[PDB]
Structure formats: structure tokens, C-alpha cells
């Protein structure tokens, strides 16, 4: 659970040459095309 | 669209929104103008 709601933590790296900014931007895009009632958020190293 | 009553709104605010708003930055206290849903067992003394 993350911030009181049921959650699932997903870890990964930006591909060689690409920055973490480019990687997260695509993860948000793919996250947007998921089923209804499924949101997302950034935690830990991605939060700061 | 009048698909939800006053109690249905009150429950949704209480169950999905109130907790997250109460943990939001600089929010001291949060009063719900309504009540969260509970399993109401409305007893009949005649049938009892």
C-alpha cells in the first residue's frame, strides 16, 4: 500500500545514453493507457 | 447527473478523498460535512 491505497512498487533504469527524465516520461505515458481506476506516483529517489 | 445521493457523495469524499487531503502539506484538521458508509443493520423489534 502507498499513501493508504493498494499499490505495487515497480523499479527500472533509463536505457544506456538516455536520462532518467526521458525514462520516467514514457513510464507516465504507458501508465496513462492502463485500465480505468489505475493511477500512479513517484517515491524515494524519483520523488526528490 | 443525479446518479449519486447526498450519502453516496459523503461516502466517496470520506473513503477516497478525506484521508489523502488530511495528509496533504499544511492541513491541520479536516471536518467531513456528511458521514462515511457503514453496514447499517436496522432491527425490527416485532420480528425479533
Swiss-Prot record, chain B:
Disruption phenotype: Loss of susceptibility to contact-dependent growth inhibition (CDI); inhibiting cells still contact the target.
Subcellular location: Cell inner membrane
Origin: domain of life: Bacteria
Upregulating conditions: Positively regulated by MarA, Rob and SoxS transcriptional regulators (at protein level).
Coiled coil: none
UniProt record similarity statement: Belongs to the resistance-nodulation-cell division (RND) (TC 2.A.6) family.
Task of the protein: AcrA-AcrB-AcrZ-TolC is a drug efflux protein complex with broad substrate specificity that uses the proton motive force to export substrates.
Oligomer and partners: Homotrimer, with large domains that extend into the periplasm, interacts with AcrA and TolC. AcrA may be required to stably link this protein and TolC. Interacts with AcrZ. Part of the AcrA-AcrB-AcrZ-TolC efflux pump.
Record-given protein name: Multidrug efflux pump subunit AcrB
Amino acid at each position: 500500500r502507498y499513501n493508504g491505497l493498494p499499490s505495487m512498487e515497480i523499479l527500472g533504469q533509463a536505457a544506456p545514453g538516455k536520462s532518467t527524465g526521458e525514462a520516467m516520461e514514457l513510464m507516465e505515458q504507458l501508465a496513462s493507457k492502463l485500465p480505468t481506476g489505475v493511477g500512479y506516483d513517484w517515491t524515494g529517489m524519483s520523488y526528490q | 447527473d443525479g446518479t449519486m445521493t447526498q450519502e453516496d457523495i459523503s461516502d466517496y469524499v470520506a473513503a477516497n478523498m478525506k484521508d489523502a487531503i488530511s495528509r496533504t502539506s499544511g492541513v491541520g484538521d479536516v471536518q467531513l460535512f456528511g458521514s462515511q458508509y457503514a453496514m447499517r443493520i436496522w432491527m425490527n423489534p416485532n420480528e425479533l
